Symmetry: D3
Subunit: 150 residues, 6 copies
């Protein structure tokens, strides 16, 4: 249960705006454990797979183009209720409606330039992690601060 994992990606706008360290620090302070981490420029295929769920929609081409427009920092965090907790820390789709204190609430203004991606569910988290990372790239032995869990 405390072994739950989520996939987060600091999108090109977030990387370009120098928000990588600020975003990672928020998750480390919360107590989640960094299990995978690497910077990369996504290829079209990985992009199309990541957004496959929208492949029938019109905006799908825009999503693929943007995520491949520059480097992305992909990461996997582990902890209890991480998937839902990470979404709460990010905010809502529209940054302008995101509450102050959340990532998008503090730094974003446009839905199209919303800084970060967080899996919306455990199953999507599982698919995305396996999509973005090779098993060799993920920590197998995870140990959080002992003052974090009862």
């Amino acid at each position: 249960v405390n072994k739950e994992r989520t996939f987060l990606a600091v999108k090109p706008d977030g990387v370009a705006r120098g928000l990588v360290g600020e975003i990672i620090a928020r998750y480390e302070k919360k107590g989640f454990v960094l299990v995978g981490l690497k910077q990369l420029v996504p290829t079209k295929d990985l992009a199309e797979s990541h957004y496959a769920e929208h492949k029938e929609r019109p905006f799908f081409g825009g999503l693929v183009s943007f995520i491949t427009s520059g480097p992305v920092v992909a990461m996997v965090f582990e902890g209890k209720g991480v998937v839902a907790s990470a979404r709460l820390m990010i905010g809502v789709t529209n940054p302008l409606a995101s509450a102050p204190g959340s990532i998008r609430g503090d730094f974003g203004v446009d839905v199209g330039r919303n800084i970060i991606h967080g899996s919306d569910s455990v199953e999507s988290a599982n698919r995305e992690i396996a999509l973005w990372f090779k098993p060799e790239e993920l920590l197998t032995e995870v140990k959080p601060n002992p003052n974090l869990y009862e």
Copy 2:
């Protein structure tokens, strides 16, 4: 649309408590662009005009007295949905009910000493900006970070 503007004023208590830089930084981090900025001690007339909407109420005299009691930092910010977004960043009238993460939620305790003023609408924003600033004092050419807007 991304040319929307709002008027913000760091009231005398906020200036006296050394919260000017902290408040400006929150808006700059969000991505809004500083279009006008100056410190001044409001005269009675500008004050009465700013709060004209309350001129029939009893507390109106108290509002005018306080805002003229010391320096005020007036500023104009530009961005998409800035008017509503800036209000969300400020919090609610009563600082004690404002959520942690918002300006009044983080620093205020009294309705009467609530640190900052934000226009409540585009039309009030337009009236206030034209009230507090001469056109010469506002940037005509505004350019935000290109990683902010799609």
Copy 3:
């Protein structure tokens, strides 16, 4: 009214995670005044009294054991609406459901390791303060920033 007081305790996990200064700073920035402060390792009796309200429940033994497992930083803050305001700053019982910007929302993950204690009411605040502090240990003459209250 502006003489209202609340009891806060940074529990063993919070002390062990180096969150004492971060927690105090949040309350000082808000404008509340530190009226009592000391680090101690609670004895079983003080613990049982603090959680007396749960003495009939099963988890009561767990509460007493944990709070006595290490040092605790007890403090008393004074200000208008401090009791409710301090609870809002802390968040909800479950850290995972606490909103970003609140103490538990920013730093906690487990109900059992939720970092801090805040009185839930004026009467409980009164009982706890008198329980944890000798009158000699509390400031009698309190003076907040004059820019805080109208």
Copy 4:
């Protein structure tokens, strides 16, 4: 003596990089009092006057061009030893040689894009303030935190 004043200007690169609030906060935290403040796009004449001391040098044309390339946030701070203290807070001409903790040490990399200007002496501070601000724009009645001066 505690009435000493200095002129600071957040140059175009600093304004464009969203460092205005961060810079003001550093001076407010230190205890200096904001006496003048306004955003403006310097004209060529004000620029040439500001850098008149270099009018015989080759790089002088570059200085004038850059400072007039965009908005600048000009400010005047008051306090004991403000002139030398503000320079120490800024760092050295070359940002790369500026120590971590100073403005240029924390945020700059190029001598040509060094973020901020601080008067190098009382006499230059006097000339610059009178150059950049009309007397009407400066606070006459200055009152710092009483816990700042003995």
Copy 5:
């Protein structure tokens, strides 16, 4: 050796300026362990004893008066080289000459209102701790983060 201790006191100006949490956080982040902590209003006798080394000097009366003018937060920190390390974190006697990054460099302007006290040596640290704290008030069992010491 890693059991070395120092005495720190947040003086009345520091407490009044809301700098208590900020100061404690700096020491916790560094890795030092809080061993004693309490707020108090020093009596004349404790004051005269604390500054006994200056009892023959003229300014001695001023030191005693100020430290007894309001609450003080006394604390004892433990760690390797804590005594010298804590002084380096504080800065020099004159806040204006203290480097940015240090406590006095970041927040002070006057020698007379220099925010904090740090023992200048192990022997003075020993005398001050035994002067300000009863043994019952100090942690006997100290355990720092295991990732701090080799």
Copy 6:
């Protein structure tokens, strides 16, 4: 010249203490560009190669053991004078002697647990980058903020 690169590694203690995001943010704020990034648990061979320069010394076995004791966040930053600048931001070998404002000055206490590694020269930076990263893992097209370089 503005294409200079350095290799930084957040060692196991730094990763375990949740300092990864804090360290990256310091470099991003400075203006350096993240060119490579990944978390890994170094193997003995990579370790021995990284510290090959000390292979004749006694402490060499201790260095290899520690760096392989847990995950490490390796990164490559690009910018003008990055190699020397990054060392200045880190501090000196002994954290206790590192000045407040630097990474080791703010967070470390023991030479053996000094949080981070920074190449000491361009040639060592070149050897380390080629040692720790495959060319495919480094950005070829680097573009910093245009407000950073003249």
